[PDB]
Amino acid sequence: QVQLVQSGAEVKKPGASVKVSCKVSGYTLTELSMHWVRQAPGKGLEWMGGFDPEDFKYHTHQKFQGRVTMTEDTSTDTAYMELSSLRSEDTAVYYCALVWGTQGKGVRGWDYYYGMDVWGQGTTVTVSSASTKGPSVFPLAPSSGTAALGCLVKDYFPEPVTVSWNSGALTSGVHTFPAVLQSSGLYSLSSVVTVPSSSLGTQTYICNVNHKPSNTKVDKRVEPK
Amino acid sequence: QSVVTQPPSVSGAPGQRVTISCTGSSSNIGAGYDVHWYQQLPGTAPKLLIYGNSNRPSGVPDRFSGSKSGTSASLAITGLQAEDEADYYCQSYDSSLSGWVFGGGTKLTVLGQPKAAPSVTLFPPSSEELQANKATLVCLISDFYPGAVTVAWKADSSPVKAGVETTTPSKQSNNKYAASSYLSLTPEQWKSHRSYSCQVTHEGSTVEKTVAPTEC
Amino acid sequence: CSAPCPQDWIWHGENCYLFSSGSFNWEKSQEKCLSLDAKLLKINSTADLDFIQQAISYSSFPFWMGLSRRNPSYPWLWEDGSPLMPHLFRVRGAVSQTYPSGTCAYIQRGAVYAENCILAAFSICQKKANLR
Amino acid sequence: CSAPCPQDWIWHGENCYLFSSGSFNWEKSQEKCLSLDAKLLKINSTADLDFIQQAISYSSFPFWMGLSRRNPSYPWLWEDGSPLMPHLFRVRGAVSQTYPSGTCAYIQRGAVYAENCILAAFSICQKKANL
């Protein structure tokens, strides 16, 4: 029975390269069909490359070629995946996986039938060069019985930011959204509060934004259009 | 047609049966290659659920089954339980690419509360942001269940994906789901169109909000 | 009155065909065909190939046929020592590799693959139909 | 002197079996069997079930057989009017649904499933052997 143990999480700058290791225990790697699969956050599985019984070669997905190298060390039963010219879009959990369906006894062509039953635990690669940066805070003005208004907290690093309304006096109808991580490596978020439309002429609305690491403290007044 | 496609979301109540289609082509499922299915529980690595279209590995129960027909295959789950809530990926091999292909994935929700259509609010760029030669449209999506949504943006009648960043749905305090989508534009792009639209599809139904540079 | 083929075989032309019940190495596959008074599949015509491709079209399994060669420099031979007719199929798979027990050919998805003779696949047995 | 079964059929016990070359809806599958002086598979015994399960063990494909019911209140019946013999197999899948062309059974490896009769599948034909 076979297990795959991958190297630890890595943080890398755009333009660098990473090399993930995948150690096989329980059987010899030279007899076995190794694959690499990755998954960006909130996205689907992407096959990167692996052994093909069609021609008995290692293939990589066209999408990578140039950037991916797969190697195996027959002495340690270790597979390696090296990904070069790293971009933010390469931020992902990298997985090694193996076809163990015939336990080294079947012709390699059984690979297409059995699929990938044995999975490493995954290796997180974060590609970021973001430095501390305070947000810009823009009003999201109410327009045409309730009315929605908010604050856009744009282009900060790192998490988190706090948003309150009218210095804590307004909590009812407040929704602060989880941030988006942009391809730039900077975060943005919005806080919206739903209020009676009849209060807009009479009640002042202010979002209190705090981003400690940049010492950005801003109270933005939100005016009707 | 060197892809396999899956619907992004399926829903059922505990004890019910649901199906997920894997749609391929003459270059993969139709070329004699088999479909495997992978189950990914929240915060876990994928695991093999079905191999060779219909086989269950050890520790996968009888109520998961699968079949292949022509250029497609299907996963069937009877007797849904809460522990089946997960993302399901189909996979085949494609002889036109000489590589393996995953479907996009299908979020399976086991209904633990009634279905709730999303609230959608679309904000145009602020005067203050345009003054800094930038422009962000903000589409905020709340109180939806199940926790899956598709967002499409339009400039006039044309689809736009460039400069769109959309969050994964996040569970709110009240157990429904929240997402945001951001369209980054130049001021010129914003001023150059009659209107922009945010279209949110949930459980096959669509809500559209529109803003125009012209409005006050 | 005797039947062309035994029960559970397929009668096609002058021959009877049977799929193995399991996955075995090529030598054990050969022994099992012999114990059924048969031999591993021998493809001598495009008509033979068409029939077998249709017969296995329901299956994604690899099926050994009676074709082998000690190493890449040797010619492909059937179990009876007759050569491969070159016009019938191209052999894919491990065509450049050398294995201690030799290289053997299987059919899968209607296409022909060379692989290590000690690895396990399904197989196809054939024998003459009784047409006296 | 005649053969029990034609070329490209499998002789087993008193019957001949053929795997269809095409994937069609159940009614068209039935008409193709009829054109070969045959009918859709009828599983009569545990011995018939063992034979068919081994014959299809190479395949992940569904095969239509001669079992159907017009709607869920009706019994499952073979095309000859006979019922499903008890303790042979369970019918799985959506046995509860109503479809325009009715519900039909296919066999796949170790299981039998209900399905909408308009969906296309390979099928198994049988007819009596010449003995």
XYZ file of C-alpha atoms in Angstrom:
704
model
C 0.000 0.000 0.000
C 1.498 3.371 -1.172
C 1.707 6.922 0.347
C 2.953 10.267 -1.178
C 4.497 12.949 1.117
C 5.083 16.408 -0.440
C 7.480 19.230 0.658
C 6.236 22.141 2.839
C 4.502 25.390 1.799
C 6.597 27.995 -0.060
C 6.328 31.770 -0.641
C 7.958 33.085 -3.854
C 8.324 36.419 -5.717
C 6.929 36.807 -9.263
C 9.721 35.696 -11.677
C 11.225 33.118 -9.256
C 10.869 29.288 -9.601
C 9.686 26.607 -7.103
C 10.528 22.879 -6.863
C 8.007 20.667 -5.093
C 9.120 17.192 -3.985
C 6.891 14.109 -3.784
C 8.367 11.112 -1.868
C 6.839 7.652 -2.529
C 6.880 4.999 0.236
C 5.525 1.394 -0.069
C 6.617 0.645 -3.675
C 9.275 1.721 -6.199
C 8.601 4.933 -8.218
C 10.318 3.580 -11.430
C 7.338 1.176 -11.952
C 4.635 3.812 -11.243
C 2.701 6.498 -13.196
C 3.168 9.954 -11.468
C 0.936 13.011 -12.284
C 0.948 16.649 -11.134
C -2.323 18.572 -10.574
C -2.793 22.087 -9.147
C -5.780 24.115 -7.822
C -5.795 27.916 -7.474
C -7.998 29.287 -4.610
C -11.727 29.022 -5.440
C -10.897 27.368 -8.828
C -10.935 23.859 -10.350
C -8.372 21.044 -10.744
C -5.776 21.586 -13.519
C -3.732 18.641 -14.848
C -0.124 19.838 -15.356
C 1.619 16.659 -16.606
C 2.408 12.963 -16.076
C 3.371 9.593 -17.502
C 1.605 8.594 -20.761
C 1.501 4.868 -21.702
C 0.640 5.950 -25.297
C 4.399 6.566 -26.045
C 5.990 5.825 -22.625
C 6.937 9.531 -22.230
C 6.187 12.267 -19.653
C 3.814 14.901 -21.154
C 3.090 18.459 -19.848
C -0.036 20.488 -20.702
C 0.746 22.913 -23.615
C -0.412 25.783 -21.294
C 2.843 25.391 -19.204
C 5.502 24.094 -21.661
C 8.717 26.011 -21.147
C 7.790 26.554 -17.486
C 7.215 22.981 -16.093
C 9.960 20.298 -15.583
C 9.158 16.876 -14.060
C 12.093 14.690 -12.868
C 12.351 11.505 -10.720
C 15.208 10.322 -8.433
C 15.203 6.487 -8.691
C 17.494 6.322 -5.531
C 15.093 8.097 -3.050
C 11.791 7.253 -4.872
C 11.201 11.056 -5.087
C 9.378 12.958 -7.921
C 9.948 16.716 -8.451
C 7.932 19.404 -10.239
C 9.719 22.692 -11.014
C 7.655 25.692 -12.205
C 9.621 28.745 -13.436
C 8.682 32.419 -14.288
C 6.144 32.346 -11.401
C 3.094 34.736 -11.662
C 0.290 35.536 -9.148
C -1.959 33.130 -11.187
C 0.470 30.280 -10.139
C -0.575 30.806 -6.476
C -2.128 27.318 -5.889
C -2.029 24.004 -4.027
C 0.206 21.642 -6.063
C -0.556 17.912 -5.837
C 1.369 14.838 -6.875
C -0.809 11.846 -7.648
C -0.133 8.267 -8.779
C -2.037 5.432 -10.564
C -1.828 2.528 -8.036
C -4.845 0.581 -9.477
C -2.744 -2.493 -10.562
C -0.120 -2.216 -7.748
C 2.771 -2.397 -10.285
C 1.439 -5.687 -11.809
C -0.667 -4.388 -14.745
C 0.376 -3.149 -18.186
C 0.740 0.686 -18.035
C -2.243 1.029 -20.453
C -4.535 0.224 -17.450
C -3.755 3.862 -16.348
C -6.624 5.212 -18.512
C -9.094 2.873 -16.740
C -7.981 3.201 -13.048
C -7.436 6.997 -12.692
C -5.472 8.691 -9.859
C -6.237 6.890 -6.553
C -3.156 7.973 -4.504
C -2.720 11.728 -3.686
C -0.013 13.666 -1.817
C -1.250 16.059 0.923
C -0.550 19.058 -1.399
C 1.971 21.925 -1.285
C 0.798 25.571 -1.050
C 2.822 27.927 -3.250
C 2.044 31.642 -2.704
C 3.430 33.998 -5.435
C 3.335 37.585 -3.936
C 5.690 40.653 -3.832
C 3.006 42.851 -2.094
C 4.416 45.290 0.519
C 2.333 47.142 3.185
C 0.020 49.596 1.346
C -2.929 51.553 2.799
C -6.295 51.534 0.980
C -7.984 54.329 -0.973
C -11.587 54.733 0.432
C -14.338 55.809 -2.043
C -18.021 56.494 -1.248
C -20.665 54.242 -2.883
C -23.498 56.805 -3.010
C -27.182 55.838 -2.645
C -29.394 56.592 -5.683
C -32.884 55.471 -6.919
C -38.455 52.375 0.884
C -34.836 51.230 1.612
C -31.574 52.561 0.122
C -28.143 50.896 -0.130
C -24.911 52.947 0.307
C -21.307 51.948 1.049
C -17.554 52.382 1.004
C -15.048 50.818 -1.405
C -11.757 50.090 0.445
C -9.412 49.657 -2.567
C -5.818 48.318 -3.024
C -4.447 47.504 0.449
C -1.970 44.949 1.826
C -2.082 43.022 3.992
C -5.416 41.822 5.457
C -7.262 42.920 7.475
C -9.159 46.254 7.417
C -12.001 47.080 9.907
C -15.134 49.041 8.787
C -17.748 50.452 11.192
C -20.480 53.019 10.457
C -21.154 56.298 12.324
C -18.339 55.306 14.788
C -20.205 52.107 15.879
C -23.712 53.712 16.287
C -24.910 51.946 13.072
C -24.821 48.067 13.041
C -28.354 47.264 11.724
C -28.347 46.524 7.943
C -24.456 46.606 7.757
C -22.783 44.022 5.440
C -18.950 44.115 5.129
C -17.920 41.721 2.306
C -14.843 39.481 2.343
C -12.035 41.096 0.295
C -11.151 40.156 -3.279
C -7.445 39.364 -3.908
C -6.577 41.092 -7.225
C -3.861 39.740 -9.631
C -1.724 42.766 -8.444
C -1.529 40.948 -5.019
C -3.568 43.806 -3.381
C -6.930 43.378 -1.566
C -10.166 45.362 -2.053
C -13.429 45.160 -0.058
C -16.802 46.925 0.177
C -19.030 47.638 3.205
C -22.707 48.410 2.447
C -25.480 49.494 4.810
C -29.186 49.404 3.873
C -31.174 52.289 5.388
C -34.653 53.860 5.048
C -34.627 56.112 1.916
C -36.403 58.798 4.024
C -33.330 59.193 6.362
C -30.993 60.242 3.467
C -31.862 63.995 3.711
C -31.530 64.072 7.532
C -29.074 61.356 8.843
C -25.300 61.608 8.035
C -23.601 58.276 7.066
C -19.814 57.870 7.613
C -17.726 54.665 7.225
C -14.778 54.408 9.674
C -11.967 52.559 7.858
C -8.898 51.333 9.772
C -5.872 49.595 8.163
C -3.381 49.420 11.101
C -0.243 48.132 9.294
C -0.203 51.317 7.056
C -1.724 53.500 9.877
C -4.577 54.440 7.450
C -7.506 55.763 9.563
C -10.199 57.399 7.383
C -13.829 58.413 8.069
C -15.460 58.826 4.638
C -18.820 60.681 4.460
C -21.279 59.078 1.940
C -23.516 61.784 0.269
C -26.605 61.089 -1.918
C -25.731 61.482 -5.685
C -13.429 20.322 -28.327
C -10.481 18.994 -26.250
C -12.390 19.936 -22.984
C -14.906 18.200 -20.690
C -17.718 20.381 -19.229
C -19.858 20.040 -16.076
C -22.634 22.311 -14.678
C -21.183 24.544 -11.918
C -23.799 23.604 -9.238
C -26.343 20.895 -8.370
C -28.736 20.822 -5.372
C -30.698 18.090 -3.549
C -32.469 17.477 -0.194
C -31.257 14.673 2.092
C -32.517 11.270 0.862
C -33.015 12.488 -2.751
C -31.059 11.463 -5.915
C -29.125 13.880 -8.220
C -27.026 13.471 -11.405
C -23.967 15.399 -12.718
C -23.197 15.214 -16.483
C -19.626 15.220 -17.879
C -19.920 16.416 -21.515
C -16.862 15.557 -23.698
C -16.117 15.021 -27.409
C -14.850 12.612 -30.126
C -11.274 13.402 -28.874
C -11.770 12.176 -25.228
C -14.872 10.264 -23.923
C -15.859 9.414 -27.536
C -12.253 8.176 -28.309
C -12.645 5.236 -25.873
C -11.188 7.024 -22.820
C -12.975 6.486 -19.445
C -14.336 9.122 -17.004
C -13.167 9.268 -13.383
C -14.889 11.370 -10.699
C -13.122 13.090 -7.767
C -14.839 14.256 -4.545
C -13.367 17.307 -2.732
C -14.936 17.959 0.723
C -14.484 21.550 2.006
C -10.782 22.124 2.885
C -9.515 18.597 1.827
C -7.397 17.186 -1.079
C -9.419 15.565 -3.918
C -10.110 11.810 -3.628
C -11.041 9.271 -6.319
C -14.782 8.604 -6.111
C -15.473 6.661 -9.372
C -12.907 5.186 -11.849
C -13.430 3.689 -15.301
C -16.902 5.331 -15.575
C -18.665 2.980 -13.017
C -16.154 1.417 -10.551
C -16.110 2.347 -6.789
C -12.710 2.145 -5.010
C -12.584 0.671 -1.413
C -14.528 2.829 1.091
C -16.849 4.452 -1.537
C -20.455 3.312 -0.881
C -22.965 1.687 -3.301
C -25.135 4.881 -3.618
C -22.517 6.563 -5.917
C -22.732 5.059 -9.417
C -21.661 6.125 -12.915
C -22.188 5.418 -16.602
C -20.824 6.442 -20.029
C -22.844 7.033 -23.255
C -21.318 8.308 -26.571
C -19.410 11.574 -25.791
C -20.783 11.959 -22.180
C -20.795 10.281 -18.774
C -22.926 10.758 -15.641
C -22.448 10.504 -11.873
C -25.559 9.419 -9.873
C -25.900 9.920 -6.061
C -29.002 8.439 -4.380
C -29.804 8.874 -0.661
C -27.970 12.238 -0.440
C -26.480 12.889 3.044
C -24.903 16.124 4.361
C -21.348 14.576 4.255
C -21.790 14.394 0.381
C -21.715 18.251 0.207
C -18.515 18.743 -1.792
C -17.109 19.746 -5.202
C -17.202 16.905 -7.806
C -14.692 16.855 -10.725
C -14.970 14.592 -13.790
C -11.690 13.704 -15.634
C -10.888 11.958 -18.959
C -7.921 11.755 -21.354
C -7.864 13.591 -24.679
C -5.820 12.043 -27.563
C -5.908 15.402 -29.528
C -3.947 17.075 -26.615
C -2.130 13.845 -25.498
C -3.046 14.779 -21.898
C -5.691 14.511 -19.154
C -8.598 16.991 -18.832
C -10.727 17.824 -15.767
C -14.221 19.282 -16.040
C -14.714 22.731 -14.424
C -16.207 21.119 -11.274
C -19.773 21.004 -9.887
C -20.593 22.265 -6.347
C -23.095 19.800 -4.795
C -25.263 21.387 -2.068
C -27.317 19.102 0.238
C -30.180 21.520 1.055
C -30.086 22.323 4.834
C -32.467 25.330 4.501
C -34.826 26.587 1.757
C -33.322 27.985 -1.536
C -32.903 31.819 -1.420
C -32.401 33.948 -4.611
C -29.607 36.593 -4.288
C -29.946 40.346 -3.553
C -27.866 42.287 -6.144
C -26.658 45.923 -5.836
C -24.493 47.508 -8.566
C -22.574 50.753 -7.858
C -20.885 52.866 -10.560
C -17.409 54.420 -10.103
C -17.317 57.296 -7.507
C -16.446 60.870 -8.637
C -13.452 60.633 -6.226
C -12.101 57.445 -7.939
C -12.488 58.835 -11.540
C -10.600 61.970 -10.227
C -7.713 59.497 -9.498
C -7.882 58.157 -13.184
C -9.400 54.816 -12.053
C -12.904 53.265 -12.287
C -14.402 50.292 -10.345
C -17.950 48.887 -10.822
C -19.021 47.023 -7.619
C -21.620 44.250 -7.864
C -22.596 42.983 -4.341
C -24.478 39.705 -4.040
C -26.056 38.592 -0.695
C -28.474 36.212 1.107
C -28.267 33.480 -1.552
C -28.587 29.706 -0.911
C -27.270 27.443 -2.238
C -23.761 29.008 -2.015
C -23.052 29.142 -5.774
C -23.472 31.915 -8.282
C -22.293 32.769 -11.843
C -21.541 36.457 -12.611
C -21.526 37.848 -16.177
C -20.628 41.489 -17.040
C -21.783 43.338 -20.178
C -20.606 46.657 -21.669
C -23.670 47.733 -23.707
C -24.548 44.270 -25.183
C -20.982 42.796 -25.282
C -19.662 40.282 -22.702
C -16.573 41.413 -20.695
C -14.267 39.175 -18.596
C -11.054 41.352 -18.684
C -10.634 43.282 -15.367
C -13.329 41.191 -13.584
C -12.386 39.791 -10.112
C -15.158 37.825 -8.283
C -14.861 36.362 -4.727
C -15.766 32.775 -3.792
C -19.103 32.685 -1.960
C -18.638 33.146 1.832
C -21.176 31.938 4.452
C -22.892 34.927 6.222
C -23.800 34.933 10.005
C -27.423 33.991 8.939
C -26.146 30.787 7.101
C -26.816 32.182 3.507
C -24.018 33.237 1.108
C -22.338 36.516 0.060
C -20.126 37.318 -2.964
C -18.727 40.437 -4.664
C -17.628 41.046 -8.260
C -15.418 44.001 -9.291
C -14.984 45.272 -12.868
C -11.845 47.507 -13.242
C -12.106 49.927 -16.236
C -10.295 53.079 -17.404
C -12.383 56.306 -17.048
C -12.417 56.390 -20.910
C -13.877 52.813 -21.077
C -16.593 53.841 -18.543
C -17.490 57.106 -20.374
C -17.231 55.351 -23.806
C -20.297 53.013 -23.297
C -24.048 53.768 -22.865
C -24.307 51.173 -19.983
C -22.602 48.360 -17.962
C -24.525 45.363 -16.505
C -23.902 42.871 -13.713
C -25.902 39.626 -14.339
C -26.076 37.089 -11.472
C -27.263 33.514 -12.277
C -28.394 31.427 -9.275
C -30.053 27.965 -9.668
C -30.590 28.722 -13.417
C -32.401 32.102 -12.726
C -30.803 35.541 -13.535
C -30.950 39.023 -11.852
C -29.501 41.961 -13.915
C -28.534 45.449 -12.558
C -27.431 48.190 -14.973
C -25.601 51.534 -14.446
C -24.875 54.305 -17.028
C -22.242 57.087 -17.019
C -25.242 59.455 -17.794
C -27.166 58.965 -14.415
C -27.479 61.434 -11.394
C -24.258 -32.611 -35.656
C -21.585 -30.562 -33.778
C -21.642 -26.776 -33.271
C -18.968 -24.543 -34.869
C -18.046 -23.124 -31.427
C -18.571 -24.058 -27.765
C -21.085 -22.191 -25.571
C -19.919 -18.725 -24.402
C -17.505 -18.270 -27.391
C -18.165 -15.975 -30.402
C -18.228 -17.673 -33.815
C -16.717 -15.437 -36.518
C -15.665 -16.850 -39.921
C -13.471 -19.955 -39.509
C -12.675 -19.264 -35.801
C -14.088 -19.131 -32.242
C -13.086 -16.268 -29.866
C -13.092 -16.070 -26.042
C -12.095 -13.213 -23.690
C -10.069 -14.274 -20.595
C -11.856 -14.115 -17.193
C -8.922 -12.185 -15.595
C -5.792 -10.075 -16.063
C -2.555 -12.192 -16.302
C 0.994 -11.907 -17.701
C 1.446 -13.007 -21.360
C 2.942 -16.467 -20.544
C 0.033 -17.338 -18.163
C -2.429 -15.894 -20.800
C -0.811 -18.265 -23.404
C -1.099 -21.290 -21.007
C -4.815 -20.548 -20.351
C -5.591 -20.413 -24.124
C -3.711 -23.710 -24.651
C -5.747 -25.388 -21.819
C -8.917 -24.376 -23.824
C -7.412 -26.093 -26.974
C -6.888 -22.518 -28.278
C -4.095 -19.967 -28.821
C -3.697 -16.199 -28.201
C -5.379 -14.060 -30.906
C -3.542 -14.066 -34.259
C -4.551 -11.213 -36.647
C -3.820 -12.377 -40.274
C -6.262 -9.966 -42.098
C -7.900 -6.508 -41.872
C -11.240 -8.506 -41.608
C -9.828 -10.217 -38.427
C -8.812 -6.749 -37.055
C -12.269 -5.177 -37.877
C -14.074 -8.060 -36.081
C -11.833 -7.814 -32.954
C -12.053 -3.962 -32.832
C -15.918 -4.266 -32.875
C -15.837 -7.181 -30.309
C -13.738 -5.108 -27.801
C -15.423 -1.705 -28.654
C -17.572 -2.104 -25.465
C -14.414 -2.447 -23.286
C -11.543 -0.122 -22.274
C -9.506 -3.188 -21.080
C -6.107 -4.116 -22.578
C -6.268 -7.579 -24.310
C -3.005 -9.510 -25.075
C -2.769 -11.069 -28.572
C -0.212 -13.779 -29.591
C 2.478 -11.277 -30.806
C 5.906 -10.957 -29.117
C 9.588 -10.184 -29.768
C 12.624 -10.709 -27.486
C 13.838 -7.046 -27.995
C 13.363 -4.088 -30.410
C 15.907 -5.389 -32.997
C 13.916 -8.675 -33.349
C 10.900 -8.994 -35.694
C 7.369 -9.365 -34.253
C 6.236 -13.046 -34.409
C 2.945 -14.811 -33.563
C 3.056 -17.836 -31.163
C 3.406 -20.201 -34.209
C 6.631 -18.334 -35.332
C 4.838 -16.709 -38.361
C 5.665 -12.982 -38.860
C 3.422 -9.899 -38.456
C 1.929 -8.806 -41.823
C 3.170 -5.172 -41.803
C 0.040 -3.541 -43.387
C -2.386 -4.416 -40.488
C -1.563 -1.990 -37.616
C 1.111 0.313 -36.154
C 2.383 -0.722 -32.704
C 2.452 2.132 -30.071
C 3.566 1.952 -26.388
C 7.075 0.778 -25.262
C 8.440 0.126 -28.808
C 12.065 1.256 -27.926
C 12.327 -0.497 -24.470
C 14.018 -3.892 -23.730
C 12.568 -6.157 -20.953
C 14.048 -9.353 -19.413
C 10.992 -11.503 -20.457
C 10.598 -9.662 -23.817
C 7.971 -7.333 -25.353
C 4.378 -8.502 -26.108
C 1.475 -6.719 -27.906
C -2.082 -5.993 -26.573
C -5.092 -4.270 -28.242
C -6.936 -1.480 -26.324
C -9.481 0.996 -27.818
C -8.864 -0.858 -31.116
C -5.140 0.212 -31.140
C -1.990 -1.979 -30.592
C 0.557 -1.414 -27.794
C 3.920 -3.008 -27.027
C 4.666 -3.645 -23.322
C 6.663 -5.803 -20.864
C 5.495 -9.507 -21.161
C 5.522 -9.957 -17.289
C 2.811 -7.253 -16.777
C -0.857 -8.374 -16.573
C -3.662 -7.728 -19.112
C -6.849 -9.466 -20.225
C -6.409 -11.647 -23.325
C -8.269 -13.072 -26.323
C -8.101 -16.798 -27.197
C -9.050 -18.230 -30.599
C -9.398 -21.701 -32.128
C -10.707 -23.189 -35.403
C -14.490 -23.466 -35.651
C -15.792 -27.039 -36.353
C -17.061 -26.706 -39.977
C -16.354 -30.347 -41.236
C -26.920 -30.004 -39.980
C -27.308 -26.355 -38.735
C -25.396 -24.317 -36.088
C -27.220 -23.482 -32.823
C -26.528 -19.731 -33.370
C -25.480 -17.461 -36.254
C -21.984 -15.933 -36.607
C -21.327 -12.995 -34.227
C -23.813 -14.378 -31.622
C -22.884 -16.169 -28.357
C -24.500 -19.570 -27.791
C -25.432 -20.102 -24.090
C -27.819 -22.921 -22.999
C -31.028 -22.854 -25.103
C -30.442 -19.306 -26.452
C -28.352 -17.084 -28.728
C -27.230 -13.604 -27.471
C -26.115 -10.563 -29.526
C -24.691 -7.218 -28.330
C -26.158 -4.402 -30.504
C -23.719 -2.496 -32.786
C -25.601 0.795 -32.146
C -26.826 2.827 -29.167
C -30.582 3.607 -29.524
C -33.717 4.289 -27.428
C -35.495 1.180 -26.048
C -38.294 1.000 -28.722
C -35.731 1.228 -31.592
C -33.506 -1.343 -29.718
C -36.555 -3.679 -29.573
C -37.254 -3.199 -33.348
C -33.549 -4.028 -34.158
C -33.834 -7.286 -32.093
C -37.162 -8.118 -33.888
C -35.476 -7.617 -37.332
C -32.986 -10.413 -36.288
C -35.969 -12.692 -35.294
C -35.010 -11.956 -31.675
C -36.216 -9.958 -28.651
C -34.589 -7.877 -25.896
C -32.765 -9.915 -23.204
C -35.020 -11.680 -20.679
C -33.259 -12.796 -17.449
C -35.282 -15.913 -16.416
C -32.918 -17.433 -13.756
C -29.871 -16.833 -11.490
C -27.877 -18.812 -14.160
C -28.981 -16.302 -16.872
C -27.983 -13.389 -14.528
C -24.516 -14.945 -13.787
C -23.898 -15.414 -17.554
C -24.936 -11.847 -18.506
C -23.016 -10.269 -15.540
C -19.811 -12.102 -16.656
C -20.455 -11.219 -20.376
C -20.790 -7.431 -19.565
C -18.002 -7.400 -16.868
C -15.637 -6.118 -19.673
C -17.875 -3.029 -20.239
C -19.004 0.029 -18.210
C -21.841 0.570 -20.775
C -25.540 0.243 -19.940
C -27.325 -2.503 -21.977
C -31.112 -2.234 -22.436
C -33.041 -5.454 -21.626
C -36.722 -6.470 -22.155
C -37.980 -5.106 -18.743
C -40.234 -1.989 -18.602
C -43.156 -0.374 -16.818
C -45.557 2.199 -18.330
C -45.598 4.232 -15.016
C -44.582 3.719 -11.343
C -48.015 2.287 -10.252
C -47.550 -0.596 -12.802
C -45.457 -3.743 -12.110
C -42.099 -4.304 -13.867
C -42.834 -6.810 -16.729
C -40.733 -8.482 -19.440
C -41.943 -7.924 -23.064
C -43.599 -11.449 -22.907
C -45.989 -10.265 -20.064
C -44.167 -12.322 -17.355
C -43.193 -10.536 -14.102
C -39.696 -10.132 -12.562
C -38.838 -13.449 -10.807
C -38.382 -12.723 -7.058
C -34.806 -12.670 -5.554
C -33.021 -12.217 -8.950
C -32.177 -8.474 -8.855
C -33.270 -5.138 -7.400
C -34.101 -2.330 -9.892
C -32.130 0.847 -8.843
C -32.193 4.459 -10.140
C -35.345 6.615 -10.585
C -38.101 3.914 -10.395
C -40.550 6.646 -9.122
C -40.424 9.112 -12.134
C -42.977 9.374 -15.006
C -41.517 9.711 -18.573
C -43.436 10.241 -21.854
C -42.190 6.901 -23.368
C -42.266 5.058 -19.968
C -39.468 3.580 -17.763
C -37.150 0.772 -19.001
C -34.374 -1.265 -17.263
C -30.721 -1.529 -18.358
C -28.079 -3.878 -16.890
C -24.571 -2.565 -16.129
C -21.969 -4.827 -14.463
C -23.276 -6.005 -11.104
C -26.458 -3.798 -11.115
C -29.826 -3.113 -12.880
C -31.115 0.498 -13.225
C -34.387 2.168 -14.262
C -34.158 4.923 -16.874
C -36.287 7.023 -19.255
C -36.961 4.697 -22.286
C -36.070 7.536 -24.794
C -32.355 7.576 -23.716
C -29.968 5.762 -26.089
C -28.032 2.672 -24.917
C -26.553 -0.459 -26.424
C -28.833 -3.469 -25.969
C -28.737 -7.272 -25.756
C -30.929 -9.408 -28.084
C -31.741 -13.106 -27.568
C -33.496 -15.884 -29.541
C -33.807 -19.695 -29.178
C -30.787 -21.742 -30.327
C -31.400 -24.358 -33.095
C -31.036 -27.664 -31.085
